[PDB]
Target: Bromodomain-containing protein 4
Amino acid sequence: SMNPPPPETSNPNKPKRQTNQLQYLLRVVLKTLWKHQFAWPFQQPVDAVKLNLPDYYKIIKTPMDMGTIKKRLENNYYWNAQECIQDFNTMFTNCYIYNKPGDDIVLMAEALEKLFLQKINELPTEE
Model:
């Protein structure tokens, strides 16, 4: 029922880069999803205590959220675009695992994921 430590956003001995694709992931993809009317549940780690979801971190063992992704992008935490794309996909998948079809939170994730897919479709060639 207690909250775990959040995913790391800093790690000096992890190799990292700022590729043009990673720049697009921050300036286009994250920016588009972050400003959306449905972004708010995804802007920080799930607080299982305040939300009274004591089973959340029993079911979701690889948590991810856009607050973490934002900090990772701002901190140049990633080596490549695939790592960041995986974080977005983990975030959406976690929501679909924990919740059920038609739940408000699932409808919100679906709207954000549609925009994610539209933006990823125009990911530039590396570089």
Q: What stands out?
A: Residues 9 and 68 are 7 Å apart (CA to CA).
